[PDB]
A paper describes a structure:
The weakest homolog is encoded by [name] (locus_tag = “[name]”; accession number ALN97938) and 32% of its identity is composed of Ugi (as encoded by Bacillus phages AR9, PBS1 and PBS2). This sequence (referred to henceforth as Ugi-2) was biochemically and biochemically/structurally validated to act as an UngIn. Ugi and Ugi-2 variants show structural conservation (RMSD = 1.343 Å) despite low sequence identity (32%). Although not identical, the negative charge distribution on the surface of each Ugi variant effectively mimics the negative charge distribution of phosphate groups on [name]-bound DNA; in addition, the grooves of DNA are mimicked by depressions on the surface of each Ugi variant. Ugi-2 has 21 acidic residues in its primary sequence, while PBS1 Ugi has 18 acidic residues. There are only eight positions of conserved negatively charged residues between the two Ugi sequence variants, of which, five are within the [name]-binding β-strand 1 and α-helix 2 in a 12aa span. A PROSITE pattern of E-X(6)-[ED]-[ED]-X-[ED]-[ED] may thus be defined for these Ugi variants. The [name]-sequestering hydrophobic pocket of PBS1 Ugi is formed by eight residues, of which, only four are identical in Ugi-2. This provides important data on tolerated variations, including the essential residues that perform [name] inhibition. Sequence diversity is not limited to the loops and other flexible secondary structures.
Residue numbers in the entry:
A (entry chain B): 3 to 88
B (entry chain A): 1 to 215
The structure:
């Protein structure tokens, strides 16, 4: 599995063309300090800026499977959940 | 001291044959970024003796026309990735200047070693080349910069980067650490970080010329 899969997944949930530009590994403490929930495992945050000025972030598990975990849009003070396993 | 000597000592102490064979086969059979000829670009544009500042990245960008062998940088006529946008936003808020290009070759020439901890990646596959040996190499680079250089600024964004403080003699060297400039982390402490002025203040405190962060 690869970025095509995550682009399709995230494009379905938003109903416009998403192309992820970067993938940054975060530790659980780091996910906690930013979104409130502390996972048991490292996440990779795949991020993009859209034409409408929106910033979309898909958190996934590590390689090799990059299984989605949460999809988020950036707001003034926080984030908007657009998908969650929990 | 020259990269040639440091690369020689590193390649005596560790056998990279299995890594070079694997990577040969990878370039043969897959899209691997950056282009073979750019893997070491951070070393070419920043000789060992010109290192004033080290900025660590994770792995190269894995999309076409993105990575060129510098951490965070992309190709001049390529989309500005979110982390760079936030680096550029803070740089404008901190130093004052607004960068029109997303190419960081001018930083490298100023003396910023833009070193990814992992120097290759398969297309679309974040971390695909994690722990094929690149961290063994990079760790020795970071150790070398700390052991032989006198007063260097290490800028460490996010925890994975901050794990390398182990390799740094924090009595000789300046450590500027903060949450990642990724849009997931940026608003929780990267804005108002001022890594660029902080670096320049430290470099002037030890008789080194400032880095020109602007174009």
């Amino acid at each position: 599995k690869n970025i095509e899969d995550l682009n399709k997944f995230a494009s379905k949930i938003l109903e416009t063309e998403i192309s992820f530009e970067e993938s940054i590994t975060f530790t659980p403490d780091e996910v906690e300090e930013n979104i409130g929930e502390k996972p048991n495992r490292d996440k990779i945050c795949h991020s993009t800026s859209l034409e409408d000025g929106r910033v979309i972030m898909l958190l996934t598990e590590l390689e090799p499977n990059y299984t989605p975990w949460k999809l988020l849009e950036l707001e003034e003070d926080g984030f908007k959940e657009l998908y969650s396993k929990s | 001291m020259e990269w040639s000597q440091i690369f020689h000592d590193i390649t005596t102490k560790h056998d990279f044959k299995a890594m070079h064979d694997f990577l040969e086969k990878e370039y043969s059979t897959a899209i691997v970024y950056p282009d073979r000829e750019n893997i070491y670009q951070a070393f070419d544009l920043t000789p060992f003796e010109n290192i004033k500042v080290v900025i660590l990245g994770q792995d190269p960008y894995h999309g076409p026309n993105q990575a060129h062998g510098l951490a965070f940088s992309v190709q001049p006529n390529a989309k500005f990735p979110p982390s760079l946008r936030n680096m550029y936003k803070e740089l404008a808020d901190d130093i004052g200047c607004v960068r029109q290009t997303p190419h960081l070759q001018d930083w490298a020439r100023e003396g910023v070693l833009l070193l990814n901890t992992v120097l290759t990646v398969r297309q679309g596959e974040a971390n695909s080349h994690r722990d094929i040996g690149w961290e063994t190499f990079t760790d020795e680079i970071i150790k070398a910069v700390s052991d032989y250089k006198e007063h260097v600024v290490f800028i460490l964004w996010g925890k994975p980067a901050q794990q390398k403080i182990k390799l740094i003699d924090t009595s000789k060297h300046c450590i500027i650490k903060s949450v990642h400039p990724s849009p997931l982390s940026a608003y929780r402490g990267f804005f108002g970080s001022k890594p660029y002025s902080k670096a320049n203040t430290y470099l002037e405190s030890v008789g080194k010329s400032p880095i020109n962060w602007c174009e």
